[PDB]
């Protein structure tokens, strides 16, 4: 496997790594024919996230050693990429290669080269069983719209309820279990929604902290976010699609 990122896509790769770090403690690397896959998983196995980087995202992309499934502490992979300010300013090209170690080379200005030799454990293909087509309800809006919706919520809030009120309103209620907490409810109209196919009365509840992790990445890139979901208990699917980039978060929802 030989990946090579140049130009502005260097920071984009860093934002994805940052985004996956707000979900799980280990980073799963899986080079595929249709691009490089970066995946992660909750400690409760109730959240799955995956970024797919199509082969044209890179300067050069060799997938298989003439197949690789990887597992690395994301604390490590973070420190390699942490602070995009130094990634924008200094790093020109970023090389990821593979033996005994996964190597990452940062070709900076003035001939300066930074090289990381991360240790890794071989693993399975971390895949979650999910299908957006199987979901009866769908939302779609620009990320910034959904980013303004979660704005009046405390960043310490773990959980939020997504529901469809009467009059085709999208309602976001904060969730708490029963010592009194502040309850915040956000109400959108169907107008600033590109697509809205969800039955009135339907409501689900998921981890807000993890949903934010996808938002932070898609807001900057100005992408379109679509949410697909079913009844309580069944997972919620949050999708992101560029020409260069694919990415989906699969979150668990509360029951009953």
């Amino acid at each position: 496997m030989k990946c090579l990122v140049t130009g502005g896509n260097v920071k984009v790769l860093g934002k994805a790594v940052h985004s996956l770090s707000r979900i799980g403690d280990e980073l799963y690397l899986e080079p595929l024919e249709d691009g490089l896959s970066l995946r992660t998983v909750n400690s409760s196995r109730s959240a799955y996230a995956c970024f797919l980087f199509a082969p044209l995202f890179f300067q050069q992309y060799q997938a298989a050693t003439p197949l690789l499934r990887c597992k690395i502490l994301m604390k490590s992979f973070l420190s390699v990429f942490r602070s995009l300010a130094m990634l924008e300013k200094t790093v020109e090209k970023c090389c990821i290669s593979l033996s005994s170690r996964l190597v990452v080379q940062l070709h900076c200005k003035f001939g300066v080269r930074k090289t990381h030799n991360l240790s890794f454990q071989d693993c399975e293909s971390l895949q979650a069983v999910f299908d957006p087509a199987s979901c009866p309800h769908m939302l779609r809006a620009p990320a910034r719209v959904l980013g303004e919706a979660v704005l009046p919520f405390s960043p310490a809030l773990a959980e939020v309820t997504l529901g469809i009120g009467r009059g085709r309103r999208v309602i976001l209620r904060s969730y708490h279990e029963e010592a009194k907490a502040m309850v915040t409810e956000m109400c959108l109209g169907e107008e600033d929604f590109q697509q809205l196919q969800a039955q009135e009365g339907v409501a689900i509840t998921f981890c807000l902290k993890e949903f934010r992790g996808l938002l932070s990445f898609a807001e900057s890139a100005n992408l379109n976010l679509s949410i697909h979901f079913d009844a309580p208990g069944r997972p919620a699917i949050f999708t992101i699609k560029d020409s260069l980039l694919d990415g989906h978060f699969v979150l668990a929802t509360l029951s009953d």
């Binding site: 196995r45 109730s46 979650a128 999910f130 279990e177 509360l254």
Partner: peptide, 11 residues
């Protein structure tokens, strides 16, 4: 709050 059903993964 933190009583989410497991996601079913392949392995």
């Amino acid at each position: 709050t933190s009583k989410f059903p497991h996601l079913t993964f392949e392995s």
